[PDB]
Design a binder for this molecule. Structure first.
Ligand SMILES: [Mg+2]
Lengths: 182, 63, 123, 189
């Protein structure tokens, strides 16, 4: 059983320096086709700063002893998400699907927080500007650059500097970035 | 392994009718010397007793 | 350098543990509370959790893995939500077994408003 | 001066080293000319920490109802058992006894703790004084049980018990009771 099933390695996206993640062993070469690899931004680029987010990677083809993987979005951890949420901070949840330059469709869920208990009207304005800014990021930037801004945190700071005028946002994140198309 | 440890202080007592107590011995009788392991000891427990365990990995929780 | 992930379903009645690779579609070692211990009343104990972690660490060493992340979960949802006592006991027993531990995540499935929570209130 | 005191004028407790390192600081090898110190166990507790061990083993041998007030016959049985252990099992006899105590003294014991919402005793470490007391109690029980209803003398059965619990003979009552209590402690970890 264990001896018969051989071993394989992994290969990260090219835009993440084609990095190495881990090794997964299966009985056959085609068995790793369609297998999600859950790893964090920190381990993909050996830095402890970006650890609260785990990236999602999908196998696309086994190039010999190496399994190339597709970055199918990220998602903030449950504990960190529940830690950011506090009292008197009306978190502006949202959900938008967009089309990048490459034609990828990404269902992004950008979230917002406020220093005080934000009114409903300001929350609606923040959500509308958030959806519009995410649309402009997807339209004006391709898949890899926009998702680097999103996962690495450029998109959150961009939302902070583009949507702070209506109300002081305590903190902004992009908790879910599920990927639909290619 | 049958490692040991010596009672360096007595936190108090533990149990319903007195019984044992809470002791933080220092494990100095094995490969894992330098570890202070909280444990409960029944009887007239005293400071400096070289109490020898059958397993010293476990530690009694905080009361 | 082989990296694995151990799944710990800790409950108030049992603390089943299974160990998989990074992709998760292949399991390496597995052992529940009653798998090694014959008392259902003691299947959820921290001592049983350390026994399970010890009996999984040697199989991990045989397979060739020395470090595992921890994805601890309660039953979650319409049942017990918080993690049981076996999680920290299993992780500490793994670390005392020589197997290195990196990230440990509490990944109990939390429902916003799921199905109807079965309960008797006072009973 | 200290005139090199030996137990009953025969066995000096100075030239004996303890095996169980925790029990060394409680079981006393202090030289006393006679095992009738008549201890003072009321000023505090654990007043036996400075008392001799031959006296303590002779006064834990009066478990029986008729044995109360009979420290003389207990010392007689102690002396003849020491003679038997020295003869058939040639060695330092108090060394054999201290090995027996360190081997048949309960390392672990189970005590009731109502944690987890269940009536369950928890397995705990045993105190050195408590462990020495239980070792002496089980030695007395084995001696009394063998010596009752038997063709073998009290001191002969005590010597058999000491040889059983000293050389790790599995047939001794003290060894079997210590293993039984440790098994019950393992059952309720
Ligand atoms: Mg009812």
């Amino acid at each position: 059983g264990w001896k018969s099933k051989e071993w394989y390695n992994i290969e990260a996206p090219v835009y993440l320096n084609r990095a190495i993640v881990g090794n997964t062993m299966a009985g056959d070469p085609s068995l790793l086709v369609g297998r999600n690899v859950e790893t964090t931004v920190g381990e993909l680029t050996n830095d402890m700063t970006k650890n609260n987010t785990k990236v999602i990677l999908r196998i696309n083809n086994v190039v010999g002893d190496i399994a190339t993987t597709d970055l199918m979005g990220h998602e903030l951890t449950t504990d960190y998400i529940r830690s950011i949420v506090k009292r008197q901070t009306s978190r502006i949840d949202a959900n938008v699907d967009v089309k990048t330059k490459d034609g990828y469709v990404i269902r992004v869920k950008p979230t917002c927080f406020t220093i005080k208990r934000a009114r409903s009207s300001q929350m609606q304005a923040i959500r509308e500007m958030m959806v519009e800014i995410v649309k402009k990021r997807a339209a004006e930037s391709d898949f890899e650059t926009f998702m680097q801004e999103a996962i690495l945190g450029r998109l959150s700071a961009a939302i902070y500097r583009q949507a702070k005028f209506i109300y002081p946002l305590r903190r902004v994140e992009i908790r879910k970035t599920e990927v639909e198309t290619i | 392994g049958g490692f040991a440890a010596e009672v360096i202080d007595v936190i108090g007592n533990t149990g319903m009718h007195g019984e044992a107590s809470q002791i933080q011995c220092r494990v100095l009788e094995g490969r894992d010397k330098g570890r202070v392991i909280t444990r409960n000891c029944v009887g007239p427990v005293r400071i400096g007793d070289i109490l020898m365990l059958l397993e010293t990995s476990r530690e009694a929780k905080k009361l | 350098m082989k990296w694995a992930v151990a799944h710990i379903k800790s409950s108030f009645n049992n603390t089943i543990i299974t160990v998989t690779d990074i992709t998760g579609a292949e399991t390496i070692a597995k052992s529940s509370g009653g798998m090694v211990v014959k008392a259902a009343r003691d299947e959820s104990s921290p001592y049983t959790a350390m026994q399970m972690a010890g009996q999984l660490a040697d199989q991990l060493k045989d397979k060739g893995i020395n470090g595992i992340h921890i994805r601890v979960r309660a039953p979650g949802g319409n049942k017990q939500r918080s993690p049981g006592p076996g999680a920290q006991a299993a992780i500490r027993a793994f670390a005392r077994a020589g197997i290195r531990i990196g990230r440990i995540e509490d990944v109990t499935p939390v429902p916003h408003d799921g199905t109807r929570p079965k309960g008797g209130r006072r009973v | 001066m200290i005139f090199l005191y030996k137990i009953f004028g025969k066995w000096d407790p100075t030239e004996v080293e303890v095996k169980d390192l925790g029990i060394k600081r409680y079981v006393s090898l202090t030289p006393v000319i006679v095992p009738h110190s008549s201890g003072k166990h009321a000023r505090q507790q654990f007043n036996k920490s400075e008392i001799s061990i031959v006296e303590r083993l002779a006064n834990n041998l009066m478990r029986t109802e008729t044995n109360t007030g009979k420290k003389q016959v207990t010392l007689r049985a102690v002396e003849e058992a020491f003679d038997i252990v020295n003869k058939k099992t040639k060695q330092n006899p108090i060394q054999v006894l201290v090995d027996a105590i360190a081997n048949a003294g309960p390392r672990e014991e189970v005590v009731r703790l109502k944690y987890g919402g269940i009536s369950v005793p928890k397995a705990v470490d045993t105190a050195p004084q408590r462990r020495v007391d239980t070792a002496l109690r089980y030695i007395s029980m084995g001696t009394n049980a063998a010596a009752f209803k038997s063709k073998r003398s009290v001191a002969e059965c005590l010597a058999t018990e000491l040889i059983g619990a000293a050389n790790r003979d599995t047939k001794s009552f003290s060894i079997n009771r210590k293993d039984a209590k440790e098994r019950v402690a393992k059952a309720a970890r």
